[model samples]
Target: GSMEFPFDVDALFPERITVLDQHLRPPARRPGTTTPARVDLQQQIMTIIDELGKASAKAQNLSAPITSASRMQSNRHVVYILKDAGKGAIIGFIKVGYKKLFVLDDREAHNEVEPLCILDFYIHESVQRHGHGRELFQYMLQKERVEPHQLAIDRPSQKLLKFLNKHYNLETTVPQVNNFVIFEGFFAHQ
Candidate 1:
């Protein structure tokens, strides 16, 4: 389903890709027009995030959304939202954060480490198979300055797994008892 907000989303985001953090600060509005109150602007941001989370949960068949404004505020995660150029409708988002994890190596030895993890990723079903997800993921990787193999994915769905394999050639994974999945080169540097 295409997400439509009552307010002017283009004025809200202003950029094709917007990065948001815990504060969830709204971007500066364009010049020469009246601006809403700060509280109202923030509420609009929260509503967009909540709606996106609900859509993602429905797509993934999860009983509850793992990504929400409250959850984003509580955790030290960064969300990158991709907006359509024409209408500023959000196409998708990818959330990532550094986590302290005890991941296993190729030999099955537990190694304690903190690495960037893909906490949640979702694209609108209508935009799926249109390369929007890859665009968002690539932008995130470049912004974070991390290789695809260096990151860990948290409980990825089958479509996500296929997406990774198709784009990054991430075929094999270092098995873990936890929900995290690490590629072969994850431990190469460390």
Candidate 2:
């Protein structure tokens, strides 16, 4: 599909958005001890997160956005954001987390494993053809040291499926009873 949603992901929202592991936890020191710039940085992150969520929902044709900074803050998901102001300006993002899922195999054996799940991913339509998506995804994979085949995608869109196929050859899939989709080699290594 050559459909590219014409939208400015940043028209609504960059100091490079950091790969927040624990989702921007508060400083452990005194509140005044923290730099004023960090305070402003926190706000920027929140704003970017909210707008990114909206853009992701729009791109997927969903009625409401299921991603948010607050949600990330509460959950243990590792979020990727692109930004370059002192704190950074937002460009795009991807949310990933682990889930203990019951996935079946062709042998009809139930396999339960906690695999990294791609909860949501979005990059500006402007940067769609660029390598930013792959860059971000690769970063996540390397930082977490997880194989692509062992990961799961949560209700992937056609665009995302194509992206995965093009970059990682993640075409063939394993059937499951949930929203998550696993690839063929998912169970072989386990």
Candidate 3:
């Protein structure tokens, strides 16, 4: 089953992928807003984020959603939301944020650095195996100007690990006491 919203999602996103920051500002209403108020537009964005977060949590089999409108408002994370162009329904989203972590390198040295971390990622179950995930990931990589191996993934799922290996040849991981995972080239420059 596909998720649907009462508001015009197509007008809300205007683009295939919408990038939302802490402000969670909605894009300028397409065509014309007519009589819609600014607060109403913002509420629509919050609803979209909240619904997507719940869906992602269910997909990940988590006890609770790690991504939420309230959390997004409180944290510095950026969320990339993918929407179906044809039907204008939301497909999925990926959440990332820069966090200071003490990650171990290949040489077992603890490196303290702040890196963009993949906090949460999910594609609708109905759309899995359709390359949407890769599309979203590639867009994020380009927009952020970050390499695949340069990112730290927080508690990555097995499917996500496999996806990285198959797409980016990212398989090697340095052990860490925390939930974050880092690849070999993570400390090459340092």
Model 3 error, position 19 (Å): 0.6
For lDDT, the strongest prediction is: 1
| Candidate 1 residue pairs that clash | none
Q: How good is model 3 by TM-score? A: 0.94
Which parts of model 3 are misplaced by more than 4 Å?
30-35, 85-87
Ranking by TM-score: 1, 3, 2
As for TM-score, the candidate ahead, 2 or 3, is: 3
Task: Name the 10 consecutive residues with the lowest summed lDDT in model 3.
Answer: 27-36
User: For candidate 2, lDDT tens digit of each residue in 1-190?
Assistant: 1112223223212123457755563223344442446566566556667778888999899999888878877788888775421222455788899988888887767888888899999887766768778878888888888999989889988888999999999999888788889998988777
Return the lDDT, model 2, position 115. Answer: 86
* Per-prediction TM-score to the true structure, in the order listed: 0.95, 0.80, 0.94
- Identify the runs in model 2 with alpha carbons over 4 angstroms from their true place: 1-17, 25-37, 84-88
Model 1 residue 113 distance off true place after TM-score fit, in angstroms: 0.7
Alpha-carbon local distance difference test for all models: 0.90, 0.73, 0.88
Residues 77-187, candidate 1, lDDT per residue (tens digit)?
999998873445778889999999999999989999999999999999897999999999999999999999999999999999999999999989999999999998999
Q: Model 3 over residues 103-147: C-alpha lDDT tens digits? A: 887777787899999999999999887898899999999999999
